[PDB]
Amino acid sequence: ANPEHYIKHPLQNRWALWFFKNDKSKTWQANLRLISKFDTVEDFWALYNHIQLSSNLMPGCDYSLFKDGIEPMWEDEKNKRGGRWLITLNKQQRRSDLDRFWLETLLCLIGESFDDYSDDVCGAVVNVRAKGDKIAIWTTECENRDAVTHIGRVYKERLGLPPKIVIGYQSHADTATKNRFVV
């Protein structure tokens, strides 16, 4: 049997998608819920086309997709010394750019679009807030400039951001209660 006809195309890693819903009755970690995991091309699209778009999510909810074994928390061993490539979005970009940016974010991860430094990526997070939405790509170490910079430069080009726009990178240790890199 020739394999192309009947086998799902496997991804290089198995990913886990998380959902967060703000509820003051529970603690923050208690509001984190793992939705599903996948490791094939077909199983990702089956899950993506089955969940609501982040534009359609209630303000205060988050989507998170991380490599299996890494949890969307800075306390995780692969996140204590890392950081995020942060993209800030205004209220009008919710309609125009939020959904296409998040899908491109997902594709750059499951597609390992960052060459050798794709191992340094931990996951991605999109937060839907009323004051403005955020999309971030998390990395495992903030002190590897060659790794963090190349990821930010490839990320900015894949989103189509013009050189007039500038994105920053913040360490989890600094951000948890400025920009370490700029591209």
Author numbering: 29 to 205, 212 to 217
Task: Give passages from the manuscript.
Crystal structures were refined using diffraction data to the resolution of 2.2 Å for 1a, 2.67 Å for 1c, and 2.66 Å for 1h. Finally, the electron density for the complex with the 4-chlorobenzyl dinucleotide (1h) indicated that the Trp102 could adapt two conformations—the one similar to that in the complex with m7GpppG, with the nitrogen atom directed towards the cap binding site, and the second flipped by 180° with the nitrogen atom directed towards the solution (similar to that observed for 1c). In the case of the benzyl modified cap 1a, for which the benzyl ring was directed upwards, most of the structural water molecules were conserved in the cavity, while for 3-MeBn7GpppG and 4-Cl-Bn7GpppG the benzyl rings were directed downwards into the cavity, and the structural water molecules were replaced by 3-methylbenzyl rings or 4-chlorobenzyl substituents. In the eIF4E complex with 1h one structural water molecule was conserved, which together with the hydroxyl group of Ser92 appeared to form polar contacts with the chlorine atom. For the eIF4E complex with 4-Cl-Bn7GpppG (1h), in which 4-chlorobenzyl appeared to be stabilized via polar contacts in the cavity, the phosphate chain could adopt two conformations, wherein one imitated the phosphate chain of m7GpppG, while in the Bn7GpppG (1a) and 3-MeBn7GpppG (1c) complexes, γ and β phosphates were shifted out of the pocket by 2–3 Å (distances measured between corresponding phosphorus atoms). The guanosine of 4-Cl-Bn7GpppG was not visible in the crystal structure, while the guanosines of Bn7GpppG and 3-MeBn7GpppG were stabilized by interactions with amino acids from the loop comprised of residues 50–59. Single halogen substitutions at the para position (1g, 1h, 1i) did not disrupt and even slightly stabilized the complex, whereas double substitutions (1j, 1k) destabilized the complex, probably due to steric hindrance.
